[PDB]
Amino acid sequence: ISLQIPIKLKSVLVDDWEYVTKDKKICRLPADVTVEMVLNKYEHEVSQELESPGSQSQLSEYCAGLKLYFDKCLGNMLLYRLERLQYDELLKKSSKDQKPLVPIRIYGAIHLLRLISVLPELISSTTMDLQSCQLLIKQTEDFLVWLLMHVDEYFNDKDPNRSDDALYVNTSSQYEGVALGM
Amino acid sequence: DKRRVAYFYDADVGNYAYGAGHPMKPHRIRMAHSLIMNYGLYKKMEIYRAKPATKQEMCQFHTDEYIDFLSRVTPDNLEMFKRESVKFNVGDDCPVFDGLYEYCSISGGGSMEGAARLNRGKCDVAVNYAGGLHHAKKSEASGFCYLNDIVLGIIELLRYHPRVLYIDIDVHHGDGVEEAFYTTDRVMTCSFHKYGEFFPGTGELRDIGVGAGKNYAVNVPLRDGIDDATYRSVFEPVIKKIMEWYQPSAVVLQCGGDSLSGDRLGCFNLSMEGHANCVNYVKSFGIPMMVVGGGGYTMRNVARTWCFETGLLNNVVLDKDLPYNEYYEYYGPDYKLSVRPSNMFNVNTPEYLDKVMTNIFANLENTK
Amino acid sequence: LNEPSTISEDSKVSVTGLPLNKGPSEKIKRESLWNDLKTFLTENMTEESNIRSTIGWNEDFCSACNQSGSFLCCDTCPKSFHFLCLDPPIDPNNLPKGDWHCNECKFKIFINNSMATLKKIESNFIKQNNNVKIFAKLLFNIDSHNPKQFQLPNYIKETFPAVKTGSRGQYSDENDKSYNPDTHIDSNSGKFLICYKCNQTRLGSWSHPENSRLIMTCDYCQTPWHLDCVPRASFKNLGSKWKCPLHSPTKVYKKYKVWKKQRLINKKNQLYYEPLQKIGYQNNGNIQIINQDFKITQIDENSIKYDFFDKIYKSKMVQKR
Amino acid sequence: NSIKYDFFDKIYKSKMVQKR
Amino acid sequence: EEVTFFEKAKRYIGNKHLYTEFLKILNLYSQDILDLDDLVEKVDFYLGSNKELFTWFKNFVGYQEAFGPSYKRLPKSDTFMPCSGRDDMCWEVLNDEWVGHPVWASEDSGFIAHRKNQYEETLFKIEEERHEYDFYIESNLRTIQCLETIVNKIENSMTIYKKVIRKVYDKERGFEIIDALHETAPVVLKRLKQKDEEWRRAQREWNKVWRELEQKVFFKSLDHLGLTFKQADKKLLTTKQLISEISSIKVDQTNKKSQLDFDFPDKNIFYDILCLADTFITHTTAYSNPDKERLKDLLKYFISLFFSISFEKIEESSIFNLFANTNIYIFFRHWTTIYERLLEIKQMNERVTKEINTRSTVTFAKDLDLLSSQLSEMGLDFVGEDAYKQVLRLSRRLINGDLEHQWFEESLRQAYNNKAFKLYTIDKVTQSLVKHAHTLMTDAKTAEIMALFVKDRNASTTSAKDQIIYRLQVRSHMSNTENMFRIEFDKRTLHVSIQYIALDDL
DNA sequence: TTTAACCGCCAAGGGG
DNA sequence: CCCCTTGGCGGTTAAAA
Ligand SMILES: [Zn+2]
Ligand SMILES: [Zn+2]
Ligand SMILES: [Zn+2]
Ligand SMILES: [Zn+2]
Ligand SMILES: [Zn+2]
């Protein structure tokens, strides 16, 4: 099924791929704008402008389902090989406190954006109907337009060398060795 | 000058072999010892045996995990170590042999003891050829090295002196010793190396240092087959300006045999006298020094060069004839004390060196 | 004490090929022939110095990344997984020590009664229809799939005809890459390589090879450069592709604030556009000299000259008034 | 190339007037 | 002036694709994007070759931390690594933020090593075998010493002994015997002594073998250019290379009369080359019986006419110009090459001979046991017999074919210390010189050109039409495509100047 | 598509 | 003893992939 991602978000995704795989950089976690925060802001800002009741409950259902699906599939199909060691570090750090792992409160705005790129390849191997998939595609498109609206604050260009709060952090020889060699 | 010269040599630094075809053998050090003992230089130097270092002194620069790994790793228990091997780069390039920890401890202890003797004032020249592993960086073996005993040396020298100058003339860039002092303005590093697609990979011209140690790191990139009349011409002005303007208190000099002509891995065309001119010019300043010995993978050359250097340090010019050491057969057809250059073509044009000097001097004009 | 006699398996092999106890190896004999006291004074003249100031202290590739390395293989399904390429990431030190089955095998054993599977999914759906149900199918099914490394979905990449996947899956772009007198000859025009900086080729001579200079011929605009004219130590053969100082930065840090040039898109999706003011029109660095966000301005070259002048005038008016 | 000449003549006269 | 800078830049860069980049950079600056410093740097790399326009740009614009390219920066999280001995000053001077890790600085590609010939590889293998023998023997010796100190005590530095006992008892019974020793010392001591004896015997024999192998390879190993030489001279001493060199010099000078220049300080080198040429001509079975004398007379006349050295002593052993075609130019270049090589050889000859005659030997064991008696039995060791003359005699021998090239090269290497590798092709270069003289003789047009040169040279008192009519006559003898070379020589100082007038006579 | 046969060019030496 | 006989090597090119 055809999905129309804006060109800026495609550029951002390509930049993420290049940063992670070529320059060996990984994400700075926990992100200061996480998946939960962006989804909640989207829901709060759109719901106050739409008055119809059904299209307002369906938005909340879509947001909750997106949160659950992100949580259930991040540790499966959203991380490169290099980023799995940091994922293991986070998992074991959480495992020391008998706590659960909530990626929506750690990752943000760039693993959700990369989450909605395989949806055409995720829906295809299912048993759903047609008019239900169309609604999902439409909702993802509205969410993408809203994300493109606030793109000058979720993806800003800052270098790891010059800023500690930058969206990406450099890795070390030991971490990269264990990741890409073990 | 007429300096009081100490000399450190452990009688066990030669009994620790790497892999079979591995180009790094410390046997050369023991060979050099014979060249120093049969030449009658024992009557002019105070030979000591530095006490081997312990974990609490290696961990001054290195980390607890790395040092703890080194002290337990063994060829016997290697297959039970699968994470630290790939993490710490202790695999094939830096192999694990039978006496790794003892060799590293001897190398560290020699450098630290020489630095201490310089500190108290017993000697004003320290020579420890076992140490000089200028590659290891705080968490990983790199280029045949496992413990950066040099950095321990500068730490001990800093415990007394306001400033230290570390000159490196090994063909490979001193990444390990430049990294540990990339930020501070106390230690000033100056490395002459081959820049290209060569092993260190680092050492670009514009690596003046970051943060508080800006303009306190000098890199001299050189091409294939440099010779004495060129290496001296590039060496002398830079060190002259450094010691006139930076004004160090002590000085460490890394005398590696990798720059010698016909070395197994190097690509320079320095003769024995071309190498010795650097040590002459460094000693020509009067400040206390701790000469170490790094690379060099042709023993018949590095042993001769190190013996000639230790003779020159004692203000004597040694005989060009060999005194019939134990390892006579190693020393070639004529059995002299000399390293002969090859006819390889020198690719270092004067214009490139002139530009390098202009950049380096312009950088240093703000280091009173 | 009566230990076993000797080591009959004494000499096995050495570096010389021979067992180190036999000697010449006569074949090598014929191959490699033609036809002030001693050190023992070191034991006593060594004084132990310890005055330190610190003295007192199945498949050969992972089924997730398609790469080789450490493998935790399975038995029910002939597949292989990295210890890290696994959900959850498991540590090689604490091996499960037991039958390890992939998620697909776990489902096929625990669930896959070929007909009853519908019932199972049905049950999940009917405990999620009242709640979020658009994602119910995906939420149920992704518990039956194996972990994978995340690759772009084969169509985001194709939006840019300047990127390509490397060997294992890496990023790759348009910058990935004794006496030789022939390097100064084009071989297509019979002319020399007049360097931009010095305007000379400096071939030297065969009789005097110490007057020639190495030349570069930049890999983007094909202009020749001496290695000495632009300070540089050696040729670029292995790493990235060399680019001479006659190119635009494509990345700018102004004091901070970053500027970057956009990427290359397929010409069908490229929206070219031309302005009308022709004097003052704030554009980015995306110009051409002669989804609607990547518009490259056609800058009308005579404008650039104008776009220069008054700016300098303005830069004067700041410091002259 | 004449518009540039006239515009810059006018602007230089204006700048001289502002810097008399 | 200031309203014409863009035209000047357009004519200076002289390219359209690079002018596009220049305009892009100017726009980048114009949009507040680029700063003033990087703009100045780019205009320095574009127009900085001129000392006039770039300065105008500089004063018109009113121009009047910096990280390196090889160090990354880790976040503060990777600062907290436990160092159980790091003191306060160590925290103060050390650095845990910036790391290089060459693999990052190598662009993940790899490293290019240095090239080593097979002789160096043979030396490395010999060194490896020597090291293995010495290491095992020394380990056994140290363990033997310790065991002796133990046994003499019991009659009434932690891994050496274990390793050596494991090596000796390789049947995997060593682990038990080590602890049995810790709780049997004399028997393992005597077994170690026996093993040491056999190892030392084998090492003596292998020392013999290694000495024999090394004595024929060491000097070859230090010969880097000499091994490739005599193959590169084949493809680098043609006519096309010389024309390429002279044209390159002309082209370089045409962006700013005497393109080439040579100086002939010595005289007897001419006689040396003549002796070599006559020896080769006498030996060679490739010409006619009168042709040999014809070639000899041609060479003698050319030498005694161009340089006016002597018309008779050659058999006892006002600036002049010369217009030439390719044949005469290549012949003169061959002559200049031979003269240059022999002058380089003869310049250092006094110090070379002084070094050879003072070559002392070591008497501790060298003269007692082992000597290199291969280059001395054939007299190719320059004992006395001043090195330049011996080199000439050996060159004549090799030209006559009674000396294989191997021993000539070996003697030259051992006498001149790889400083005379460029004499490996004396025979072939003399053969090429003779062939070029023959081709110069057997060409009608070339013969006419040399006839004109002879007339002009012997005239020695010409008119104001000297150059023009001579050039016109030679060009009439020549075609309308081949190049022209003006070779001049002044008897005052023996200096030869070459100008490359390819087609400038028209 | 490239890379080894393949004929010229050279020089050392084993042995019949 | 002298000639195959070996041993290598470089530009062309046609042949196996
Ligand atoms: Zn080195
Ligand atoms: Zn994997
Ligand atoms: Zn399975
Ligand atoms: Zn140039
Ligand atoms: Zn370019």
Question: Which features characterize this protein?
Answer:
heteropentamer; A: mainly alpha; two-stranded antiparallel ribbon; 7 helices; 2 strands; 2% strand; globular; E: mainly alpha; 4 domains; 60% helix; binds zinc ion; DNA-binding; Transcriptional regulatory protein RCO1 (chain D); Transcriptional regulatory protein SIN3 (chain E); hydrolase (chain B)
Strand content of chain A: under 5%
Q: Give the tally of β-strands of chain A.
A: 2
How large, in whole angstroms, is the Cα Rg of chain A? 17 Å
CATH superfamily annotation of chain B:
Histone deacetylase domain
CATH topology category name of chain B: Arginase, Chain A
Biggest β-sheet description of chain B:
6 strands, parallel
Helix/strand order of chain B, N-terminal first: EHEHHHHEHEHEEHEHEHH
CATH class of chain B: Alpha Beta
Distance between the termini of chain B: 27 Å
What's the total count of β strands of chain B? Answer: 8
Overall SS class of chain A: mainly alpha
Q: Given the helix and strand composition of chain B, which structural class is it?
A: alpha/beta
End-to-end distance of chain A: 38 Å
PDB class: gene regulation
Keywords: Dynamic Histone Modifications, Gene Regulation, Histone Deacetylase Complex
Assembly: heptameric
Entry title: Cryo-EM structure of Rpd3S in loose-state Rpd3S-NCP complex
Task: Give me a quick take on this structure.
Helix content of chain A is 53%, strand content 2%. Chain A is an all-alpha fold and 182 residues long. Chain A has one domain (1-182).
